[PDB]
Amino acid sequence: DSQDLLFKAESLIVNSTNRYHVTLQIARRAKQARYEEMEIKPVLRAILEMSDELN
Template sequence: MTLRNPHLGIDNDELMRRVEALINASKNRYRITVQVANRAKRRRYDDPNDVEEGWMKPIRRAIIEMSDELTEPEIIGDE
């Protein structure tokens, strides 16, 4: 069963495909997991009063943003 929230514009299956793409593109599964978590945390604390983005959880937004940036190697590359 695929759940789709009209506000997100992305269903759970698509989100899982994006997560898999991030993990597969990274040499280190732990590092990409930490990078996604850090981006979500940073996003959450940057503007806690952001009403427009309140309907999307920070972790979902971080996954979507980072999967869109797969073409930039510094996002998922080893530092």
């Protein structure tokens, strides 16, 4: 849900120590995602993946 994405976003903003750097990482990840998927929306999947990787 939207709320879930909002909690995951907040979760990634913390433990990163740089909101800009983690926004750049999310952008890059989502770009790669859509690129290797054209072969859900990229930024959303990127945030889901990065949250699930933070264990």
